[PDB]
Amino acid sequence: LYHTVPPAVVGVGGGGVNAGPVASGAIVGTNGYVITTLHSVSKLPEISVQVATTGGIRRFPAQVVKTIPGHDLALLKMQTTEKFLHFRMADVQTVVPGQQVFAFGRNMAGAPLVRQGLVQSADAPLAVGATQITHLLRSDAVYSWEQTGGPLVNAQGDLVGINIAATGPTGKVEGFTVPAQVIVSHLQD
């Protein structure tokens, strides 16, 4: 699993040469579609997506194609003629409390992050700035802010959702997750 999922896990950040990922994202289409969290890229002047290859990190400029503000998601398209391995939206599955899930990300250096955990809730609300997002998943697989925007998968490696790391009142990290059907159903082309 830790072999076949990471290639579709990207880093996302600004366009500076010396800039690295500020969040993660998931490649969801051959021609360079990335889903990531909206609050991570909306204030960025330029967006660059960082992709792992056998020869090291490759960077591609990206633009926003569609925003899903109600669920803090953004859909990017990389500007490239290259083709990518991706999550197959057909294979998108749901999860239930108790189920085991895996949250992937890339750090500020482009290295892969994975953490395992259980689904603790399948209906939690979250406040990202002014938006009240509802019906979120909740899981302890999300321990780090660098995991925000990256994918949650099940044990078979199907895309299950997109992760949001949030702040507790005590400052403890709590894992949240936008269910992956929010992707298919707020999308068309």
Author numbering: 34 to 222
Paper lines:
Here, we characterize a protein called MamO that helps to initiate the formation of a magnetic mineral called magnetite in cells of the magnetotactic bacterium Magentospirillum magneticum AMB-1. Although predicted to be a trypsin-like protease, we show that MamO has lost its ancestral catalytic activity and instead gained a new function as a metal-binding scaffold. Two genes in the MAI, mamE and mamO, are homologous to the HtrA proteases, a ubiquitous family of trypsin-like enzymes that functions using His-Asp-Ser catalytic triads. It appears to have lost the ability to perform serine protease activity and instead performs two noncatalytic functions: direct metal binding to promote magnetite nucleation and activation of MamE’s proteolytic activity.
To explore this possibility further, we determined the crystal structure of the protease domain. It crystallizes as a monomer with the chymotrypsin fold and the catalytic residues properly placed. Loop L1 of MamO adopts the inactive conformation seen in many HtrA proteases in which the main chain carbonyl of residue 192 (chymotrypsin numbering; W222 in MamO) prevents access to the oxyanion hole. Although glycine is highly conserved at position 193 in the trypsin family and is critical for catalysis, MamO contains a glutamate (E223) at this position. Therefore, the active configuration of MamO would contain a strong steric clash between the E223 side chain and the main chain carbonyl of W222. The active configuration is strongly disfavored unless glycine occupies position 193, indicating that the E223 side-chain in MamO likely prevents the formation of an oxyanion hole. While refining the MamO structure, we observed a peptide bound near the predicted peptide-binding groove. We suspect its source is the flexible N-terminal region from a neighboring MamO in the crystal that is not built into the model. However, the bulky side-chain of W222 in MamO seems to block the exit path between loops LA and LD, forcing the peptide away from the catalytic center. Overall, the structural features of the L1 loop appear incompatible with protease activity: E223 provides an energetic barrier to catalysis while W222 serves as a physical barrier to productive substrate binding.
